[PDB]
Every structure is written in C-alpha cells, then in structure tokens.
Design an enzyme around this catalytic site. Structure first.
Site, short mmCIF file in Angstrom:
data_model
loop_
_atom_site.label_atom_id
_atom_site.label_comp_id
_atom_site.label_asym_id
_atom_site.label_seq_id
_atom_site.Cartn_x
_atom_site.Cartn_y
_atom_site.Cartn_z
N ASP B 63 0.82 -1.21 0.00
CA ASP B 63 0.00 0.00 0.00
C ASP B 63 0.85 1.26 0.00
OD1 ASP B 63 -1.49 -2.21 0.77
OD2 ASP B 63 -2.88 -1.04 1.94
N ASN B 123 -8.44 -2.58 -2.73
CA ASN B 123 -9.83 -2.27 -2.43
C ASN B 123 -10.13 -0.78 -2.43
OD1 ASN B 123 -8.24 -2.50 0.01
ND2 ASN B 123 -10.11 -2.04 1.15
N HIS B 124 -9.11 0.08 -2.40
CA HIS B 124 -9.37 1.50 -2.50
C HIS B 124 -9.42 2.01 -3.94
CE1 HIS B 124 -9.12 2.81 1.81
NE2 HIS B 124 -8.70 1.57 1.89
N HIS B 247 -2.51 -4.82 2.06
CA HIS B 247 -3.85 -4.57 2.59
C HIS B 247 -3.86 -4.35 4.12
CE1 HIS B 247 -8.23 -4.68 2.41
NE2 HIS B 247 -8.34 -5.88 2.95
MN LIG Z 1 -6.48 -2.63 1.18
MN LIG Z 2 -4.71 -0.21 2.36
#
Ligand SMILES: [Mn+2]
Ligand SMILES: [Mn+2]
Ligand SMILES: [Br-]
Ligand SMILES: [Br-]
Ligand SMILES: [F-]
Lengths: 46, 299
Positions: B63, B123-124, B247
């Site tokens: 990330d 997921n973002h 994540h």
């Molecule tokens: Mn994530």
């Molecule tokens: Mn993240």
C-alpha cells in the site's frame, strides 16, 4: 521448492519525514532519476 | 525529441522534480494531462491479462495510500523505472495527502514501461471506497468531480492478480472460498466495479488470521479471514510456494504468515500519521530468492 528468503540481504534506509526524498539515493543526488530514451533490457510479462 | 499527445516525458519530469523539494509540495498537472494518463493506461490495462503472468527479477510493493514522497523514496532506494521492474499490489489512493501525484506517477510509468511496470487493483481503487476515504475530496478540491469519474473508469480496468514464475501468487487482499481454479480469475471481464461479495471482493479484501482454522468473518464488514490451513491447501493445489499480498499495515513493512507461506507487504511508512511502521518492498531475484528493502522512519 523454488522460492527462498535471504533475509541477510535485507537493506534498510532510515529517513526523517521532512528529508528530501533524493537523500535516500545510494549514490547521491547526481544520479539521473529519468532518462526518456533509456530502454528496458527485456520485458517481464509473459 | 518527439513530444507525443500525452506529453508523457514532461509529466514524469514535473512529477519527479520534487525529489529535491521539501516533502509536501504539490505537483499540479493539467486536467487534460491527467485524463491522458487515465485513458492510455486504461487501454494498456485492457490489452494485458487480468491475471498477470510475470517473470523475475521484480520488486513488489504494498500500500501507498497517497504518501507521494514515500513513493519517491521507494523509487530512489529501489531504483527508478526501468532500472528495476515493479509490481504494486494496489491501494494507491486514500488516507494520504497526495493521492493525485501518487497515482499519476504510477500511471505514467505504466505507460512508459508497459512490459516492466505493473499495478494491481486494491480495495481503495473503487469508487464506493475512495469516495469516502479521501481521493474524491482531493479530486474535487484540486480538479473537479468529472476527473474523479475518469479515474474510476480507469481503476475499473486494473488487473487483479499476478503469478511470478509460476510460484508466487500476488493480490491485494487474499484468498477466497470461491477461488478454486485460476481460470475463474481469467474469466473476470473488464471494466468491472468491485462487488460487495464474491471472488473479486475477497481477492481485494480478505485477511490472514492465525486464530481461525478455516474461514472466519472479517472485521472490515466484508469478505473473510482465512487460516494457515487454507493457505497450505491453496499452495499445494496450485503448485505454488508463496502468497504475496498487502492490505494490512505491518510494523516492519513486511510480515510473514503460516511458516512463511504468505507475506504481507506494506509500503507506506508512518501510515497516515497514526502508526510508526516501516515501509518495505520485496526484491525477487531471478532464482526467486526474496529479500526486503525497507524505508524506516527515524525522526
Ligand atoms: Mn487494502
Ligand atoms: Mn490499504
Ligand atoms: Br459528473
Ligand atoms: Br503465523
Ligand atoms: F528488478
């Protein structure tokens, strides 16, 4: 069977949040970040 | 030399200009420059498989969450493209202050080095999520809502997983109870949004948990947790050695699970000012020997 870990090869750069990002350059501030004509040696997408 | 309609080399130069600046300075591209990055990278994404099959050598990153100057440090330390090959695991936007510069540099390198630079979906990279957690506000403040929608349509075309030399399975989140054949991933059609449940959701949302035997319910409100036995069975069934995912913030920037059958990478140090974590990338050499290059806060 093939993947291995060589944690002794880990390397760590310390930084302060207010430091210029260029200051983590292993060879210093004269390294060229971007040459628009430099080609990759070979692709890695199959 | 020849400019091109995207003005790509100029965009990269301006994004990298602030290597010599006090962290926090914005790089304000034009709207049409950013739209060009979105449209060309979208075309490149759709021209390559949704399940990327990659070769080593490769540096894999977790990330970033809009921490643009930590992204610049990662490249400065790991090598600027194409000096190294890169695979990012998603979550480029939200939480941090400069999601815009972050995703723009990443999309620009995708266009510049399309066979040597790779971005998975996190997921973002999803409108229903980055509407809330910062990216929408950033787009609206510094540009307009239309440009946010252009990013969304681009993100809807991001590939979802990667396999390195038939041995390292990479995705943003983790395993799925529905993931039984790699063909199920290959059959996902783009553009797509991220559904609230199912295979694509779990690949972007699930988490390992040593305290569950099989599949548990996930504190995030969607998807699942999976235990060490699920990882072991998955690797066995697909003749894989390692799961590489992101994540979750991890203190050292990388973190092993289930006797090093899984590693979590996280590449945003001092994550959104709330944690005191290092950020790391995993260097995978041509023998599939894995080591870690770490950015560690001092202050
Ligand atoms: Mn994530
Ligand atoms: Mn993240
Ligand atoms: Br609109
Ligand atoms: Br564990
Ligand atoms: F590399």
């Amino acid at each position: 069977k093939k993947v291995t870990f060589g944690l002794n090869r880990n390397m760590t750069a310390e930084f302060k949040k207010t430091d210029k990002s260029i200051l983590v350059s292993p060879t210093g501030p004269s390294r060229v970040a971007f040459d628009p004509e430099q080609k990759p040696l070979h692709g890695v997408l199959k | 030399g020849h400019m091109g309609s995207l003005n790509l080399d100029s965009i990269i130069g301006r994004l990298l200009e602030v290597r010599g600046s006090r962290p926090g300075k914005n790089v304000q591209l034009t709207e049409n420059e950013i739209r060009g990055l979105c449209l060309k990278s979208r075309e490149i994404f759709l021209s390559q498989p949704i399940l990327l099959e990659l070769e080593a050598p490769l540096k894999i990153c977790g990330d970033i969450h809009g921490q643009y100057y930590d992204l610049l440090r990662l490249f400065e330390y790991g090598g600027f493209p194409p000096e190294s090959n890169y695979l990012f695991l998603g979550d480029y936007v939200d939480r941090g202050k400069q999601s815009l510069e972050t995703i723009c540099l990443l999309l620009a390198y995708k266009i510049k080095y399309p066979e040597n630079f790779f971005l998975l979906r996190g997921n973002h990279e999803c409108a229903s999520i980055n509407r809330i957690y910062g990216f929408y506000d950033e787009c609206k403040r510094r540009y307009n809502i239309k440009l946010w929608k252009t990013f969304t349509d681009c993100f809807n075309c991001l590939p979802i997983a990667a396999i390195v030399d038939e041995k390292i399975f990479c995705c943003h989140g983790g395993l799925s109870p529905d993931l039984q054949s790699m063909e199920q991933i290959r059959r996902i059609m783009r553009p797509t949004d991220v559904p609230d449940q199912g295979l694509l959701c779990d690949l972007l949302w699930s988490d390992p948990d040593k305290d569950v035997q099989g599949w548990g319910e996930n504190d995030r409100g969607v998807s699942f947790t999976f235990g060490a036995e699920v990882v072991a069975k998955f690797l066995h069934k697909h003749d894989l050695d390692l799961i590489c995912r992101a994540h979750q913030v991890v203190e050292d920037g990388y973190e092993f699970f289930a006797k090093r059958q899984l590693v979590t990478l996280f590449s945003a140090p001092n994550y959104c000012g709330e944690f005191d974590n290092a950020g790391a990338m995993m260097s995978v050499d041509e023998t599939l020997m894995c080591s870690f290059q770490i950015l560690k806060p001092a202050d």
